[PDB]
Structure formats: structure tokens, C-alpha cells
Design a protein around this ligand. Structure first.
Ligand SMILES: CO[C@H]1O[C@H](CO)[C@@H](S[C@@H]2O[C@H](CO)[C@@H](S[C@@H]3O[C@H](CO)[C@@H](S[C@@H]4O[C@H](CO)[C@@H](S[C@@H]5O[C@H](CO)[C@@H](O)[C@H](O)[C@H]5O)[C@H](O)[C@H]4O)[C@H](O)[C@H]3O)[C@H](O)[C@H]2O)[C@H](O)[C@H]1O
Ligand SMILES: *[C@@H]1O[C@H](CO)[C@@H](O)[C@H](O)[C@H]1NC(C)=O
Ligand SMILES: [Mg+2]
Length: 364
């Protein structure tokens, strides 16, 4: 069915069974304290995004989630549940990363692989047109074209990232869908030297895709820990005047809008509840200590430019291993402010889950 305006308005957000199963089968059995078990059970009911970060998730997780939401809605959910899904499988993924977990390479048929992945997602979304579906498109992709074109892999991937982003925007432009392109965070694209080039890039992509109706705007702070709005700049933000996501968005939107793209935003807060964090530097993204579950997902943001506060990266799922010998080890995950020992990226990291519960704000 079609919708008008903010896709988060007028629906509930489904809390998926993948994350609920992680909490109930992996986390809770390891927790003996009654109050922490109860808190854990409660966080399993908070609706976070489900990531299609490997191709195998399309005909498994995506289908299962949409099928379960259809079932709940046909069984009388009021208001209807909507799905929250991340598209995250560009070839030569994470071009500036020390190590990437992306499965596809441009050199090994990656373009064709990705187009087929988008095409299959389109077929599934059409099948489930009755389930309003909100997408984040490709974390850690086009933000690299703003600041990392000195990296050979990024310069070599740039035309592919652009073309395949436009392909996704057009192929997934369906009446029951909303899309938000990743736009980094205040401490990446919100620095004053980066913010106008970022606006130019995203507004051009928007133009070149034909300004598809389904595109609502941009997602920020995905998998990061930034505040929405705090009174004091955290120490690791200095000297950026855009030290939180509100500052970033309020500076970024007018630039985007003058360039043709009046973007609305969604802001990850899933690991933002404690401010400042235990990061020693802003760019320390991996398994950062001193973080908490943050404000619960809602359409009732109170801010004109923000369609929703969301939980994009699901807290407790590891960002990367701390085993320095592992094939895809990323040194960020070995830093002093990264919790250890940490398992492979995407595996449950129970100590980290417990940290997030202890520091939750609002508490569970
Ligand atoms: C005055 O301003 C001038 O001086 C300033 C001081 O030097 C600098 S500040 C400087 O800015 C630069 C950017 O211009 C950054 S570097 C920047 O850091 C980003 C993170 O904060 C990363 S994005 C990060 O990338 C990760 C891979 O490296 C991925 S991990 C990926 O995650 C997914 C999701 O969880 C997972 O499934 C995958 O398995 C994982 O691989 C992560 O998600 C991303 O968030 C960016 O790439 C990097 O360029 C410096 O920190 C900062 O100090 C001013 O720039 C200058 O104007
Ligand atoms: C991706 O998964 C689909 C099924 O959803 C499969 O048909 C396809 O072969 C997979 N892609 C690659 C490159 O293996
Ligand atoms: Mg609920």
C-alpha cells in the first residue's frame, strides 16, 4: 500500500526474531542476575534494523521477517507493524577500511552479483507489498567518496558505488518502501571542511536517480555512538563545532536542500545512551567501551528534520574480532578502548551486551 509523508508515522516497528533469538538463546543463558535477565528480555523487544549484510540473508532472513510481520498484521496488530532493513553488500565494500568483511569483489563479478541481489530484494519486497518497509542503503559507502578518494580502492570503486547506488534507488523505488542513504556521522562528514562536498555528492546522486519518491533522505550515526543532542562537546570531538548529530543535521540539511534534496533524517541511537562515551578518539568505532543502549526508536522525534530515532546497528552484535591473527582482523578492534576479547564481526558479544545494558539510558 502507498503512504504519504514520514514512513515511521502511523505504524509500529517490528522487533525481529533474529535479534530476539540472540538475546534469548545466546545472552540470557549467560546472565544469572535476575534484574539483568529481565532487562535483557526487555531489550529483545526493542525494534532494531535487520541487516542484509551477506547475500544468504535475502532468501532467509528477509523473507522470514516479512512473512512474520504479515502474520502479525493479519492477526490484528494495531497499528500495523513495519519492517526496518539495511542493504549492505556493495562489491569492494568498505573501500577505506583496514579490513572488510564484504563478500564480493568488483574483480570477481561483483557488479553483476550486486545487481542480482538488488533484483531479488525487489522481487521479495513486491511479494510483501502489504508490509511497509524502511531501508537504510549501504552504510560506509558513498561517504568514502567525500573524504577517502586518496585511497586507491576507493577511487577505483567510486564509479561502481555511484552507479550501483543509483541502481538500488531506482529498483527499490516502490510505493510501500522508504529509503534513507547512509551519510556517515557528525565526526566524519559533519566536520566543516567535509559538509558542503557531502551535500553536493548526495544531492547529485538524488538528482541522477530521478529523485525517486521512496527516498526520504539520509541515515546518520549508523553503527556509531554519537549523541543526538548534548550540552557539552565530548572531549574526543574537539574542535568540530558539529559535535552531536543535531548540530550536524541542522548544518547539513540547508546545504542539501539548496542543492535539490530536502532530506529527512533517521539517526541511530542504539549505542548512544551514555554520553560522553569511553572512546579515546572519535574515529574509534570498534566495540567501544563506555557506551549504553540509547533512546528507544520513535517517530516522535520532536525535530522537524528527523523522521525517527532508530536502532540501526543492533547492540550486542560484534563489530570485529580482537584476535590479531584472524584473517579479517581490523586494528580498530585491538585498540585500548575496544572491549576484549571480542569474537568475529556479526557474532554475539555478550560482555558488550551487558555493558550496553548497564549503561542504558533510558534504563531497562
Ligand atoms: C579541522 O578538521 C580537519 O582536522 C580534523 C582533525 O584531524 C579532521 S577529523 C578526522 O576526520 C576523518 C574523516 O574526515 C575521520 S576518519 C573516518 O572515520 C570514520 C569513523 O568515524 C570511518 S566510517 C567507519 O568505517 C568502518 C570501516 O573502517 C566501518 S566498520 C564496518 O561496520 C559495519 C557496520 O557495523 C560492519 O558490518 C562491518 O563488518 C565493518 O567492517 C564503520 O561502520 C564506519 O562507521 C571513515 O571511513 C574514516 O574515513 C577521523 O576519525 C577524524 O579524526 C577533519 O576531517 C579535517 O577536516
Ligand atoms: C545470492 O543469493 C541468491 C538467492 O537469493 C542466489 O540465487 C545467488 O546465486 C547468490 N549470489 C551469488 C553471487 O552467489
Ligand atoms: Mg513493540
Amino acid at each position: 500500500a502507498p503512504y504519504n509523508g514520514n514512513p515511521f508515522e502511523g505504524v509500529q516497528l517490528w522487533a525481529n526474531n533474529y535479534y530476539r533469538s540472540e538475546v534469548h538463546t545466546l545472552a540470557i543463558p549467560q546472565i544469572t542476575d535476575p534484574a539483568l535477565r529481565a532487562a535483557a528480555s526487555a531489550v529483545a523487544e526493542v525494534p532494531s534494523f535487520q541487516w542484509l549484510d551477506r547475500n544468504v540473508t535475502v532468501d532467509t532472513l528477509l523473507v522470514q521477517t516479512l512473512s512474520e510481520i504479515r502474520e502479525a498484521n493479519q492477526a490484528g496488530a494495531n497499528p500495523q507493524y513495519a519492517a526496518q532493513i539495511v542493504v549492505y553488500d556493495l562489491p569492494d565494500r568498505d573501500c577505506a577500511a583496514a579490513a572488510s568483511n564484504g563478500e564480493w569483489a568488483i574483480a570477481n563479478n561483483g557488479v553483476n552479483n550486486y545487481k542480482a541481489y538488488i533484483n531479488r530484494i525487489r522481487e521479495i519486497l513486491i511479494s510483501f507489498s502489504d508490509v511497509r518497509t524502511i531501508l537504510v542503503i549501504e552504510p560506509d559507502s558513498l561517504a568514502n567518496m567525500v573524504t577517502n578518494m586518496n585511497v586507491p580502492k576507493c577511487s577505483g570503486a567510486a564509479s561502481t558505488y555511484r552507479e550501483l547506488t543509483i541502481y538500488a534507488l531506482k529498483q527499490l523505488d516502490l510505493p510501500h518502501v522508504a529509503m534513507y542513504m547512509d551519510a556517515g556521522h557528525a565526526g566524519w562528514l559533519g566536520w566543516p571542511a567535509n559538509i558542503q562536498p557531502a551535500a553536493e555528492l548526495f544531492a547529485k546522486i538524488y538528482e541522477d536517480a530521478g529523485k525517486p519518491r521512496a527516498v526520504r533522505g539520509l541515515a546518520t550515526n549508523v553503527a556509531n555512538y554519537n549523541a543526538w543532542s548534548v550540552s557539552s562537546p565530548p572531549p574526543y570531538t574537539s574542535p568540530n563545532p558539529n559535535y552531536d548529530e543535531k548540530h550536524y543535521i541542522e548544518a547539513f540539511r540547508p546545504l542539501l536542500e539548496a542543492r535539490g534534496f530536502p532530506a529527512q533524517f533517521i539517526v541511530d541511537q542504539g549505542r548512544s545512551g551514555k554520553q560522553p562515551t569511553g572512546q579515546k578518539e572519535w574515529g574509534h568505532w570498534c566495540n567501544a567501551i563506555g557506551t549504553g543502549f540509547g533512546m528507544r526508536p520513535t517517530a516522535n522525534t520532536g525535530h522537524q528534520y528527523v523522521d525517527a530515532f532508530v536502532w540501526v546497528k543492533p547492540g550486542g552484535e560484534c563489530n570485529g574480532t580482537s584476535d590479531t591473527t584472524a584473517a579479517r582482523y581490523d586494528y580498530h578492534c585491538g585498540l585500548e578502548d575496544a572491549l576484549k576479547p571480542a569474537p568475529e564481526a556479526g557474532q554475539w558479544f555478550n560482555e558488550y551486551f551487558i555493558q550496553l545494558l548497564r549503561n542504558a539510558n533510558p534504563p531497562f
